[PDB]
Amino acid sequence: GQGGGTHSQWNKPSKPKTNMKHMAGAAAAGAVVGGLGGYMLGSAMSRPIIHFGSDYEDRYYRENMHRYPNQVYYRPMDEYSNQNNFVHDCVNITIKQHTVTTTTKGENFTETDVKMMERVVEQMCITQYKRESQAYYQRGSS
């Protein structure tokens, strides 16, 4: 090339800072009880498909199903008096462990979503329930 430029300089280099810390250590990811006190999980199953009105409702249901519970706790049907809602108690413990966990982290559920979230888990709790309910029935319930 040819030509020239500013010979004066006011800039000076600096020294870099290097160090290495290839280490590992303990960590935690919550795993604290959600106020249940004394409840334990049952089995994992593939969450069902429930349709409400049409393919429109059914597709929106399936669009988001990745975020919904797919597990249930045990079956407190032995409490008896709460016969019909016993299922709901089973589902409420697994659902509150999941819905709040994902909502507070970065989600939200509309009326349809909050209605369907109970329906998906109820069906699975039914799967556990009738498996056992046939036993009290075969016992003669006496």
Query: From CA 67, how far away is CA 27, in angstroms rounded?
Result: 25
Query: From CA 17, how far away is CA 132, in angstroms rounded?
Result: 66
Q: Where are the domains of the chain?
A: 37-142
- Could you give the angle at which helices 111-138 and 55-64 cross, rounded to 10 degrees? 90
Query: From CA 129, how far away is CA 75, in angstroms rounded?
Result: 6
Residue 105 near residue 48 (C-beta atoms within 8 A):
no
Q: What share of the chain is helix, strand, coil (3-state, %, to 5)?
A: 45, 5, 50
CATH topology of domain 37-142: Major Prion Protein (1.10.790)
Q: How was this structure determined?
A: NMR
Query: From CA 114, how far away is CA 98, in angstroms rounded?
Result: 12
Q: Take residue 134 and report the two structure tokens written for it.
A: 């046939």
Of 62, 59, 86, 57, nearest to 74 by C-alpha is: 86
Query: From CA 87, how far away is CA 41, in angstroms rounded?
Result: 14
